[PDB]
Amino acid sequence: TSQVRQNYHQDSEKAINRQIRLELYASYVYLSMSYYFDRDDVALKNFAKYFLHQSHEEREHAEKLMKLQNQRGGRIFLQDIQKPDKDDWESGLRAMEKALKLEKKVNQSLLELHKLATKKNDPHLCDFIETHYLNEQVKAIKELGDHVTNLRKMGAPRSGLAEYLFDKHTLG
Amino acid sequence: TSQVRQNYHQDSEKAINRQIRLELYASYVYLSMSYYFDRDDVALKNFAKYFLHQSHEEREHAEKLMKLQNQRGGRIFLQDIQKPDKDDWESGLRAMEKALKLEKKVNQSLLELHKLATKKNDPHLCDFIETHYLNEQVKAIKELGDHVTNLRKMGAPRSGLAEYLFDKHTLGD
Amino acid sequence: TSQVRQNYHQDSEKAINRQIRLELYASYVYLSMSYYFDRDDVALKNFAKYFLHQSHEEREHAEKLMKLQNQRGGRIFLQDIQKPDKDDWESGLRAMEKALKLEKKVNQSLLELHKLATKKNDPHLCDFIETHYLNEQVKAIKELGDHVTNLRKMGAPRSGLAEYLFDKHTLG
Amino acid sequence: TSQVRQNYHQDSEKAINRQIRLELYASYVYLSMSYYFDRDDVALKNFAKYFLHQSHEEREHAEKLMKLQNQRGGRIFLQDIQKPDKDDWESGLRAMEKALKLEKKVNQSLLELHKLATKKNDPHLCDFIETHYLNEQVKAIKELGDHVTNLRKMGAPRSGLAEYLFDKHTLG
Numbered sequence: 001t002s003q004v005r006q007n008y009h010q011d012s013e014k015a016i017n018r019q020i021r022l023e024l025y026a027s028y029v030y031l032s033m034s035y036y037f038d039r040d041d042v043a044l045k046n047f048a049k050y051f052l053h054q055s056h057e058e059r060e061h062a063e064k065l066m067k068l069q070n071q072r073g074g075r076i077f078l079q080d081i082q083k084p085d086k087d088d089w090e091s092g093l094r095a096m097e098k099a100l101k102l103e104k105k106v107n108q109s110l111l112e113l114h115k116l117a118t119k120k121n122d123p124h125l126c127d128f129i130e131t132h133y134l135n136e137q138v139k140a141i142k143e144l145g146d147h148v149t150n151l152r153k154m155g156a157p158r159s160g161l162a163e164y165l166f167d168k169h170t171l172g
Numbered sequence: 173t174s175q176v177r178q179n180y181h182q183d184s185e186k187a188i189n190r191q192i193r194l195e196l197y198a199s200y201v202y203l204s205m206s207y208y209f210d211r212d213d214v215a216l217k218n219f220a221k222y223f224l225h226q227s228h229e230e231r232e233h234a235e236k237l238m239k240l241q242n243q244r245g246g247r248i249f250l251q252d253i254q255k256p257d258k259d260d261w262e263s264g265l266r267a268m269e270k271a272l273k274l275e276k277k278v279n280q281s282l283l284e285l286h287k288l289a290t291k292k293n294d295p296h297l298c299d300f301i302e303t304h305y306l307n308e309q310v311k312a313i314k315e316l317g318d319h320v321t322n323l324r325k326m327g328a329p330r331s332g333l334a335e336y337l338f339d340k341h342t343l344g345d
Numbered sequence: 346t347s348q349v350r351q352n353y354h355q356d357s358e359k360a361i362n363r364q365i366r367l368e369l370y371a372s373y374v375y376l377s378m379s380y381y382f383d384r385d386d387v388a389l390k391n392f393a394k395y396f397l398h399q400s401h402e403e404r405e406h407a408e409k410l411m412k413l414q415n416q417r418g419g420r421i422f423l424q425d426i427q428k429p430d431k432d433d434w435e436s437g438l439r440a441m442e443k444a445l446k447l448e449k450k451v452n453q454s455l456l457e458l459h460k461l462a463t464k465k466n467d468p469h470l471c472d473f474i475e476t477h478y479l480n481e482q483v484k485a486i487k488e489l490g491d492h493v494t495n496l497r498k499m500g501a502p503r504s505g506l507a508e509y510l511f512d513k514h515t516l517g
Numbered sequence: 518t519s520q521v522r523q524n525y526h527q528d529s530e531k532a533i534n535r536q537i538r539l540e541l542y543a544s545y546v547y548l549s550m551s552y553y554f555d556r557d558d559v560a561l562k563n564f565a566k567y568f569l570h571q572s573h574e575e576r577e578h579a580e581k582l583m584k585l586q587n588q589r590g591g592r593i594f595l596q597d598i599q600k601p602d603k604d605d606w607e608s609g610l611r612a613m614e615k616a617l618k619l620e621k622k623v624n625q626s627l628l629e630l631h632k633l634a635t636k637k638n639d640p641h642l643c644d645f646i647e648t649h650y651l652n653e654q655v656k657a658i659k660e661l662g663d664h665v666t667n668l669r670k671m672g673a674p675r676s677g678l679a680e681y682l683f684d685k686h687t688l689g
């Protein structure tokens with residue numbers, strides 16, 4: 001038991017270990033997504049930049065949890081990072097659609113972590129998740145919301161014109 | 173009853189008054205620690221500065237609780253600040269350990285204060301504690317652990333070289 | 346199919362995909378190593394920062410392979426990233442030894458990868474390897490071995506003074 | 518035999534003379550392409566700028582080979598530069614499509630030059646082609662890859678709208 005541990009219960013400590021792995025996973029997904037749009041037969045450079053940014057952003061989330069773990073005197077245990085669902089994502093609209101469910105997923109995970117931390121009477125941990133993760137998710141989900149909407153109204157996935165112009169005007 | 177007071181239970185008001193006193197005791201304990209390292213038979217300038225900084229920070233922590241007390245309607249009531257329980261803090265390692273213990277006492281008190289505030293459905297107070305006091309406490313405790321670990325790995329307290337170098341390289345740079 | 350493909354052999358395409366995964370894997374290891382040193386009971390902040398920088402650099406190596414895969418017409422298939430071999434890396438010296446041992450592994454795999462491309466007469470892929478990877482690996486390995494040496498001469502892993510000072514004077 | 522010649526075999530010396538002429542040829546093609554898009558009844562200013570840039574770029578490739586020839590003590594012999602395949606290229610998408618096969622062509626030529634230079638145990642020459650030509654081609658081909666893709670998904674050649682917007686947003 002670390003000299004720093006105080007009010008920090010094993011269930012939280014292992015749930016944090018599960019969020020870390022989850023953040024690392026979205027990172028991988030977003031990486032895959034990104035280089036799908038770099039493909040010569042897809043060629044959408046800004047969609048690519050966007051998901052590459054998202055990806056590096058998820059990796060920051062992972063590291064920040066790893067930092068907390070050490071701050072609270074827990075101990076990190078990392079798993080296999082899982083291969084992502086697809087290795088091809090069809091289109092921008094579909095890419096964004098999966099991105100959105102992925103983030104809704106991670107959000108549910110964060111909420112349960114919070115619900116869990118409330119039960120342990122862990123206020124520091126509660127505020128950490130609120131401060132840094134909850135509003136990021138809300139916004140991240142709102143953002144993806146808007147992009148899908150926009151692509152549909154534009155006539156995607158059907159017209160490849162929409163996806164080109166959205167790459168330029170919304171993401172470029 | 174203060175015109176400003178709203179949703180602020182007299183138990184919270186009394187608790188915050190005890191927290192105030194606790195932060196002030198802390199500031200005192202660090203002042204004491206700081207001027208031990210300033211003794212000619214100890215002479216660790218940077219230990220002395222590190223602790224003085226700590227004294228001033230806890231003083232700020234108190235000042236901010238007193239601020240909060242007025243903002244909420246409460247009335248501040250100050251008690252005696254009791255001297256720390258040592259005049260001689262032994263070694264640099266030992267001081268740090270004792271400092272770690274205190275921040276932990278303080279953090280325990282703060283957590284009690286949060287449980288209360290939850291129970292009394294005072295969320296402004298909950299979030300005030302979260303926002304200005306608990307992350308700060310976690311950071312302070314983590315850095316202290318870090319320092320102890322290091323002084324131990326270097327062979328303190330027996331090795332006085334370990335203390336001199338820690339003082340140069342960790343608390344100087 | 347794939348309009349850009351030219352002189353790009355099925356086998357290279359697959360060994361690339363393998364390399365890619367090995368780079369990611371190595372990123373993970375450095376990341377594990379980094380937060381090991383962050384621990385309240387290890388507390389060597391420059392080791393931690395060092396391995397974190399290694400972790401980000403390994404990621405860059407991977408993305409550059411993913412880019413090349415697309416450059417050549419091939420297709421990227423991501424696999425599970427294994428977890429690192431360890432949770433606890435025991436010391437600065439031992440962390441460094443495994444890092445050396447690791448980078449030699451990746452080198453070997455890139456040396457093998459160069460043989461494949463020489464067999465297949467892909468001079469581009471040969472130069473791409475030489476130019477972005479083999480010298481990077483020689484320098485990394487040289488550097489790691491220098492650290493390892495210094496930490497022994499210093500009396501790691503036994504002397505805790507040694508690791509502290511190396512953290513300050515060589516890594517910080 | 519020039520006082521500078523060393524390890525430089527006639528077959529290479531004449532193959533270099535063939536690449537020079539080949540580079541000069543792509544230059545001409547790209548010139549023709551460019552002024553096709555300057556035509557009043559085509560009016561695509563950025564497509565035009567793009568192929569004019571490409572053209573001046575090929576001429577640099579030619580000069581650099583001419584320089585090598587002198588550096589290795591070979592002797593330059595220039596041919597007719599051949600008129601280009603078409604004098605009209607229909608469309609942007611078709612223009613890009615031919616550009617792409619032209620570059621795949623030149624690339625095959627470079628690869629054979631390399632294969633040839635390996636056989637002569639000419640390492641300087643091997644590295645020159647790798648360093649300066651091979652990756653330029655790979656990238657040049659990837660670039661043209663993307664542009665065609667993009668124009669097709671946009672509804673070209675059919676819609677003249679696509680070609681106008683691509684002229685503005687990708688090439689302008």
Ligand SMILES: [Ca+2]
Nearest residue numbers: 127299302303
């Ligand atoms: Ca808050």
Ligand SMILES: [Ca+2]
Nearest residue numbers: 472475644647
């Ligand atoms: Ca070479």
Ligand SMILES: [Fe+3]
Nearest residue numbers: 054057058140
């Ligand atoms: Fe995000």
Ligand SMILES: [Fe+3]
Nearest residue numbers: 023058061106
């Ligand atoms: Fe996230």
Ligand SMILES: [Fe+3]
Nearest residue numbers: 195230233278
């Ligand atoms: Fe405090």
Ligand SMILES: [Fe+3]
Nearest residue numbers: 226229230312
């Ligand atoms: Fe403090």
Ligand SMILES: [Fe+3]
Nearest residue numbers: 399402403485
């Ligand atoms: Fe490295």
Ligand SMILES: [Fe+3]
Nearest residue numbers: 402481484485
């Ligand atoms: Fe480097």
Ligand SMILES: [Fe+3]
Nearest residue numbers: 368403406451
């Ligand atoms: Fe690497």
Ligand SMILES: [Fe+3]
Nearest residue numbers: 571574575657
């Ligand atoms: Fe070109």
Ligand SMILES: [Fe+3]
Nearest residue numbers: 540575578623
């Ligand atoms: Fe060329």
